[PDB]
């Protein structure tokens, strides 16, 4: 109940001063707790959750980083104090902690980029999931766009789509649409360290995919090429957490786990073909990102005379003679 | 020397090689400490232009708008490494090579015109202290062309 998840949280302040009365807290706790396990424990994992969910929602950038740090002496008062068991990520809500994390990274990886921009993109995200105190007091807002940033990366590309609509394409309006693509990747690039420190979300990468391709149908050489780098800098995140996931999954309830096997193997085949068009010599880094993906590789040593790539590919392979 | 697959793949890659460089933009000739300085660098600009400027045009008469194909196809960061393949091997560190860490940006591929080409070889004469190989050369390259050098 409330007066739980109250109690901890007041643990957790003295567990910043001293430790010896929140370690009989955390004492009275497993005696006085149910333990069992399927339910009751997951009671205490939605306490821990709803307090790392509100050293979220806790100057407004050195405010934030206050709050990477709260949320480190929270993660680290929670190992000791253990802390060593709960998890209720299930559907849609231990992981739940790394991922507030690397959203709170994600939150000051476009607090560290601010320019006119992005806080239009921003205005019109807030003021469509609801509206604004206007007391002053107009980021419009963040501590609750950061428990909640997914979804100013869903809106701050729906606001490049109407700024594509009027973009007339015309080259200023073509380098307004890869200043965006620059944001939400090295905001995919600080998610990705995040966890080296250790389908809305993939939507709005497959939208931009398609729309970093009918540009560069009409753009300056050089300029086609940083937008094609930076795609392939997107779309090396998506099938690298698509490996992840499958590597989590394993054994019994099988056929789920070869449905989402076709699923993403419809996807590098669709990201393959897509640059197809583009330059190969990004190739063998999407073929070594998917580390296999091979019938794209394969198809790409096949239109130009690299029969020496085709057997470079072979000479460092599991089965590959097999294969080609 | 090599055969015919190996001599487009090679021209196209050296296409863009020439082009890469005539698009580099002339120096900046002010900047430097005396007249005879930066009158060097100058006259080394203009045979830079000059003579990847006829490779670029010959290359490209081969075919129509064959240029721009070649920067549609190669500017792709694929051709950096299809160009550092071909040209070294690939033991060598490709960190510390300036080849694999340049950042090739819009390349123009806009064909030279004949009128640039013309003030650049005059410029460009005494490159070579005037070898009548370089004249022999450029009236050679001048002679495929509608306008004759001066």
């Given at each position: ?198 389908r809305?979300v993939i939507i709005?990468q497959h939208?931009?995919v398609l ?20 795609a392939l800098?997107d779309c090396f995140l998506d099938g690298y957490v698509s490996q992840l996931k499958s590597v989590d999954k394993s054994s019994?309830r099988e056929r789920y786990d070869n449905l989402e096997m076709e699923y993403l193997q419809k996807r590098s085949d669709l990201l393959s073909p897509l640059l197809s068009?583009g330059?190969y010599?990004w190739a063998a880094s999407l073929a070594e990102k998917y580390c296999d993906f091979d019938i794209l590789v394969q198809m790409c040593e096949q ?10 590919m072979?000479?460092?392979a599991d089965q590959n003679?097999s294969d080609f | ?150």
């Amino acid at each position: 109940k409330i007066k739980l998840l109250k109690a901890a949280f007041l643990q957790y302040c003295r567990k910043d001063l001293g430790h010896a009365q929140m370690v009989v807290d955390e004492l009275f706790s497993s005696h006085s707790d149910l333990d069992s396990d399927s339910e009751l424990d997951r009671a205490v994992t939605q306490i821990s959750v709803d307090l790392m969910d509100d050293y979220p929602a806790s100057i407004i950038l050195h405010q934030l980083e206050d709050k990477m740090k709260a949320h480190s002496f929270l993660m680290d008062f929670i190992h000791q104090v253990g802390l060593f068991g709960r998890l209720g990520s299930f559907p849609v809500r231990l992981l739940l902690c790394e991922h507030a994390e690397k959203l709170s990274a994600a939150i000051v990886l476009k607090n560290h980029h601010s320019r006119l921009s992005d806080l239009v993109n921003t205005a019109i995200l807030i003021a469509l999931n609801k509206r604004e105190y206007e007391i002053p007091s107009n980021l419009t807002p963040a501590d609750v766009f950061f428990r909640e940033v997914s979804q100013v990366d869903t809106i701050c590309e729906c606001l490049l789509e109407h700024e594509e609509q009027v973009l007339r394409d015309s080259i200023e309006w073509a380098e307004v649409v890869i200043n965006v693509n620059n944001i939400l990747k090295d905001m995919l690039q600080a998610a990705s360290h995040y966890r080296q420190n250790r389908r809305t979300v993939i939507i709005r990468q497959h939208e931009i995919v398609l729309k970093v391709a009918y540009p560069q149908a009409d753009s300056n050489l050089r300029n086609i090429v940083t937008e094609q780098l930076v795609a392939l800098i997107d779309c090396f995140l998506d099938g690298y957490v698509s490996q992840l996931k499958s590597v989590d999954k394993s054994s019994n309830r099988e056929r789920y786990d070869n449905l989402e096997m076709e699923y993403l193997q419809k996807r590098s085949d669709l990201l393959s073909p897509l640059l197809s068009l583009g330059q190969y010599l990004w190739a063998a880094s999407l073929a070594e990102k998917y580390c296999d993906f091979d019938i794209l590789v394969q198809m790409c040593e096949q239109t130009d005379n690299q029969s020496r790539l085709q057997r470079y590919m072979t000479q460092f392979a599991d089965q590959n003679f097999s294969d080609f | 020397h090599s055969s015919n697959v190996q001599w487009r793949a090679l021209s196209e890659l050296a296409a863009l090689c020439y082009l890469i460089a005539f698009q580099v933009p002339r120096p900046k000739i002010k900047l430097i400490k005396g007249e005879a300085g930066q009158n060097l660098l100058e006259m080394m600009a203009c045979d830079r232009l000059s003579q990847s400027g006829h490779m670029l045009l010959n290359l490209s008469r081969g075919k129509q708008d064959f240029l721009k194909e070649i920067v549609e196809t190669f500017a792709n960061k694929s051709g950096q490494s299809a160009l550092y393949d071909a040209l070294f091997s690939s033991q060598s560190p490709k960190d510390t090579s300036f080849l694999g860490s340049d950042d090739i940006g819009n390349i123009d591929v806009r064909e030279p015109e004949l009128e640039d080409l013309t003030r650049y070889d005059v410029g460009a004469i005494r490159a070579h202290n005037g070898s009548l190989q370089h004249l022999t050369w450029l009236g050679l390259q001048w002679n495929s062309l509608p306008a004759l050098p001066g």
